[PDB]
Design a protein around this nucleic acid. Structure first.
Lengths: 185, 222, 171, 51, 58, 159
RNA sequence: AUACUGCCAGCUGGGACUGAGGACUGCGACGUAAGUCAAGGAUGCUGGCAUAAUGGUUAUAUGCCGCCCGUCUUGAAACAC
RNA sequence: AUAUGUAAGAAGUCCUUGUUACUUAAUUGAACGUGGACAUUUGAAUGAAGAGCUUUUAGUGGGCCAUUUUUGGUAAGCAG
RNA sequence: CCUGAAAAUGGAUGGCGCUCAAGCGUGUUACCUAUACUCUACCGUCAGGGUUGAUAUGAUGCCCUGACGAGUAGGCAGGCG
């Protein structure tokens, strides 16, 4: 017998081998496992694990988010890299000439980028141009702003968006939610 | 890239140089070992000559071996056995003797036998059952390169360099001792010498501090 | 194991105000050195304000019997705990050594009074080779001039399970 | 593939310890020492032999 | 039928399975619960330092 | 029925002291507490306002708020399987500065001072504390200290 | 100059179980110079038998061990269902 | 005695304020700062088997027995 | 050691039997054997890694290393029909 200090036969807890059955995603994985093993570039390691991520863990990146990213000083000519969808933002009126590498582009997002004179490349094209991830800037979308997460941690005095169908007066705005009816949370 | 003699010659020459200094260092350790034991003997003779009593230094190293199984152990000694890396019966580790570690030993006294190992048993422990913790893996020492690749930053280059850092508790004892995987000993070849293990050694049992008699117990377990 | 007579000299730890403490010594019969140093602290804890933590042992030595091949009369004074209380006795036994008489003494104490080693204190082991200092009749009978006795009914041990003649107990 | 224990397999012993050659050759396991008659004091034997 | 009333037996063991971790500490604790007079003044002092710093590194 | 009020089982805990009743000596009101100071909690039974709960007697915390007569103390309290952050509004009579905290700050200055002296010459000052070490070898002289031989005493009544 | 203790990288024997693993590498040892070696896991030689002989299956005998399953229950082989 | 809180530092330490509407008689302080001085010892030991974190959901919510402490009871294979 | 010492079917130091014991107290050894310990093989699990090499070897392929394995209620996974 052994006095075990930790749980035995414990799986890693991180993803490898993305859950997706998409062959082209798997093709990108096999390319980036090779890069993450033979290159020593930290960029290739994070791209490899980012390709395993589930859809909610790959929030969309709007071209607004990229334009702000390219406004970092020294970052104007960097290759913007996003593992996921690049979406189009109609709240901006100017887009620079940048290069964006992404898994997916929406029709407006791709049209916005090419009209400004830049490129809309995939991650296999980025690897040819940047095997070590040279001059790249990885863009991640907002992950804690989706609708599901605002119900996480719901409890007394937490302010976390009850799970509710109908919204309005007489839908959970009473006893327990105001001091004029009992108590407040 | 013809590569028949040029590359292998340099590597063998580098290996030969590492052997010469390992040989030089092992000769120095033997001289230091022999000097210390004689000097203790000479001091005892001199104190006897001048009508006085020579009190030997308190032993600086203990080897502790867990002699109890893993069932029915109260939480505090169970935590101490884990921090001493004794998670199996007959598992043994070296412990640098200090008040911080001595109080640890008194807590786990009913579950272990320990004492003061000599150079002979440490050499035999490391040679026979010596495994290094490398990448969280238990790899047999079996080669000077394996210690030099993991403890060379502390100047420990050979198996004897590792043994030296254990027998004479050195500045890098903690790194050298933790590098060693907990020793996995057998049951004693001739038995425990007592009918019942789970009394103190003083009471005719087996657990607790047997000062020098750990050498006989360990050598028969190793 | 075989009892060995150890001399144990210890002292209380040397503080600043009191360097060179009073250096108490005991002769204690023990199996080995570990039990020797243990038995020392047990008794020295009984006669002085000192325990193992607050003191040190300055010398541990074996005392050998002066002549291990001369038989002597040993006067042994002992205190021991029975189930009801404590008693001091003076026993005595023939032997060639101090140690083997003490081994004998613990065997007799266990046999006659069911006293385990835990219960027995050896107060004083004294040697005498002069008669009329011997008080016990179970020892005086071996001191008569020109002692000689048979060993009647000699039982001979058999190596094999069967033998082919009735045994003889002659001597 | 297979662990070989020194103190047996003298070859693996010499690989780990080049000094095993010299220790063996000079017989440092059985080495004599010079003698000088440093006599303990008479008080020391009186204390030991004290009744 | 009477049952068992209460025991803390097994409760310490349960609490140690994935247990007694200390609360995570942060730089910049929340200024809730501290004096509003200090809070109101702290807001003005922090504002001036940001303006003072911005002027220096213009 | 059972009784669990605020001050249940506080008979001796909140008892004042032997020959230490009455008015509190004023040095307790002269001590200054800043945010971040490590304080002990020992409830003074004479002062009934700003009193800690009996759970917090003997607990040591950190000041986070300083008010007219009181200090907010953060105390970690074990609730189930995790520690919860508790905030105590305690009057100054029920707290005192931790002495171990003040001792460590002196070590911080002593460590910096020792580093400054050693850096002038590089003598490996080794600021790090060490456990008590096993004793080195020593020689005990017997002159004037002849060993005195002891034996177990016989049993006797002494009644 | 010795029934004790310690050490020997001292010596000489007698038994047992195991032989995992590459189309080519490492660390070492041994003679002063064809290279060998017990050095990152068994080979060499010699028999008998190409068949139910070994072995698989099954029946019995023998040695030792083996309460009736499901369930409820703190607890079941239960004289609980 | 045992049990128990805290601390043993990089979010730490050493300058005439840099800010404020707080505070002070007062650049007095308080809090938070810019620049300066501190990787093999980063300020006890031992260990660390990867940290930290989130979501969601099953079963369970009759317990019982050693040692030790202990209550009611003569006691109990009793009750707590 | 004996008296004190009385319960109901026949009866239990487990049984036989044991009397310088095979009883009792103690000491010293030798010896026996667990699914425990040491070492080795094989299965699985988990972990950490290697591998874009020739006119043979899908890279969830091939391979290296270490540790671990009890399980009701229950969860999950890979499979069988």
């Amino acid at each position: 017998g052994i006095d075990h200090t930790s749980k035995q036969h414990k799986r890693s807890g991180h993803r490898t081998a993305p859950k997706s059955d998409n062959v082209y995603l798997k093709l990108l994985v096999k390319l980036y496992t090779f890069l993450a093993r033979r290159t020593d570039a930290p960029f290739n390691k994070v791209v490899l694990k980012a390709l395993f991520l589930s859809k909610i863990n790959r929030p969309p990146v709007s071209v607004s988010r990229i334009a702000r990213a390219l406004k970092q000083e020294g970052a104007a000519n960097k290759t913007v890299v996003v593992v996921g969808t690049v979406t189009d933002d109609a709240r901006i009126f100017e887009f620079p000439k940048t290069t964006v590498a992404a898994l997916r582009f929406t029709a407006g997002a791709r049209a916005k980028i090419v009209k400004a004179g830049g490129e809309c490349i995939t991650l296999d094209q980025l690897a040819v141009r940047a095997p070590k991830g040279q001059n790249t800037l990885i863009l991640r979308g907002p992950r804690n702003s989706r609708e599901a997460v605002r119900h996480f941690g719901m409890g007394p005095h937490k302010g976390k968006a009850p799970r509710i169908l109908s919204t309005g007066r007489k839908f959970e705005r009473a006893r327990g939610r105001r001091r004029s009816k009992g108590f407040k949370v | 890239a013809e590569q028949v003699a040029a590359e292998r010659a340099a590597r063998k020459a580098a290996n030969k140089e590492k052997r010469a200094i390992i040989l030089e260092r092992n000769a120095a350790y033997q001289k230091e070992y022999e000097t210390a034991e004689r000097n203790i003997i000479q001091a005892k003779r001199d104190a006897k000559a001048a009508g006085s009593y020579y009190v030997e230094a308190q032993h600086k190293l203990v080897f502790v071996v867990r002699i109890k199984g893993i069932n029915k152990i109260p939480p505090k000694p169970r935590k101490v056995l884990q921090l001493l890396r004794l998670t199996r019966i007959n598992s043994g580790t070296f412990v640098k003797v200090t008040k911080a570690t001595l109080e640890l030993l008194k807590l786990i006294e009913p579950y272990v036998a320990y004492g003061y190992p000599s150079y002979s048993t440490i050499r035999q422990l490391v040679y026979k059952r010596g495994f290094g913790k490398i990448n969280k893996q238990r790899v047999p020492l079996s080669d000077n390169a394996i210690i030099e690749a993991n403890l060379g930053k502390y100047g420990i280059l050979s198996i004897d360099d590792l043994i030296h850092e254990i027998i004479t508790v050195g500045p890098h004892f903690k790194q050298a001792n933790n590098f060693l995987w907990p020793f996995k000993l057998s049951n004693p070849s001739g038995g425990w010498g007592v009918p019942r293990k789970f009394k103190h050694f003083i009471q005719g049992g087996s657990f607790g501090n047997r000062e020098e008699f750990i050498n006989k117990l360990v050598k028969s377990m190793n | 194991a075989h009892f060995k007579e150890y001399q144990v000299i210890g002292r209380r730890l040397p503080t600043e105000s009191v360097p060179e403490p009073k250096l108490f010594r005991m002769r204690i019969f023990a199996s080995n050195e570990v039990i020797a140093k243990s038995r020392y602290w047990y008794f020295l804890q009984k006669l002085h304000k000192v325990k193992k933590a607050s003191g040190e042992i300055v010398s541990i030595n074996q005392i050998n019997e002066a002549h291990p091949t001369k038989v002597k009369n040993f006067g042994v004074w002992v205190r021991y705990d029975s189930r009801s209380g404590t008693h001091n006795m003076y026993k005595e036994i023939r032997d060639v050594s101090r140690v083997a008489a003490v081994e004998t003494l613990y065997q007799d104490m266990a046999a006659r009074h069911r006293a385990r080693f835990r219960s027995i204190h050896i107060l004083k082991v004294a040697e005498i080779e002069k008669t009329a200092d011997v008080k016990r009749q179970y020892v005086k009978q071996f001191l008569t001039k020109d002692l000689k006795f048979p060993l009647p009914h000699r039982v001979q041990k058999s190596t094999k399970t069967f033998s082919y003649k009735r045994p003889s107990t002659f001597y | 593939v297979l662990k070989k224990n020194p103190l047996k397999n003298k070859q693996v012993l010499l690989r780990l310890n080049p000094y095993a050659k010299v220790f063996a050759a000079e017989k440092l396991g059985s080495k004599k020492a010079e003698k000088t008659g440093t006599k303990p004091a008479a008080v020391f034997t009186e204390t030991l032999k004290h009744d | 039928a009477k049952s068992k009333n209460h025991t803390a037996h097994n409760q310490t063991r349960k609490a140690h399975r994935n247990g007694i971790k200390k609360p995570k500490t942060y730089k910049y604790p929340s200024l809730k619960g501290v004096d509003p007079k200090f809070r109101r003044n702290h807001k003005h002092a922090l504002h001036g330092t940001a303006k003072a710093l911005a002027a220096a590194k213009k | 029925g059972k009784s669990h009020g605020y001050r249940s089982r506080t008979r001796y805990m909140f008892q004042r002291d032997f020959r230490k009743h009455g008015a509190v000596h004023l040095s307790t009101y002269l001590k200054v507490y800043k945010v971040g100071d490590i304080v002990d909690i020992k409830a003074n039974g004479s002062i009934q306002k700003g009193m800690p709960h009996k759970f917090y007697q003997g607990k040591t915390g950190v000041v986070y708020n300083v008010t007219k007569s009181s200090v907010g103390v953060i105390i970690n309290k074990m609730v189930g399987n995790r520690y919860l952050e508790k905030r105590l509004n305690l009057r100054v009579e029920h707290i005192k500065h931790s002495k171990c905290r003040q001792e460590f700050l002196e070590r911080v200055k002593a460590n910096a001072a020792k580093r400054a002296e050693a850096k002038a010459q590089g003598v490996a000052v080794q600021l790090k504390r060490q456990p008590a070490q096993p004793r080195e070898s020593r020689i005990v002289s017997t002159e004037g200290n002849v060993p005195q031989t002891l034996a177990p005493v016989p049993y006797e009544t002494f009644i």
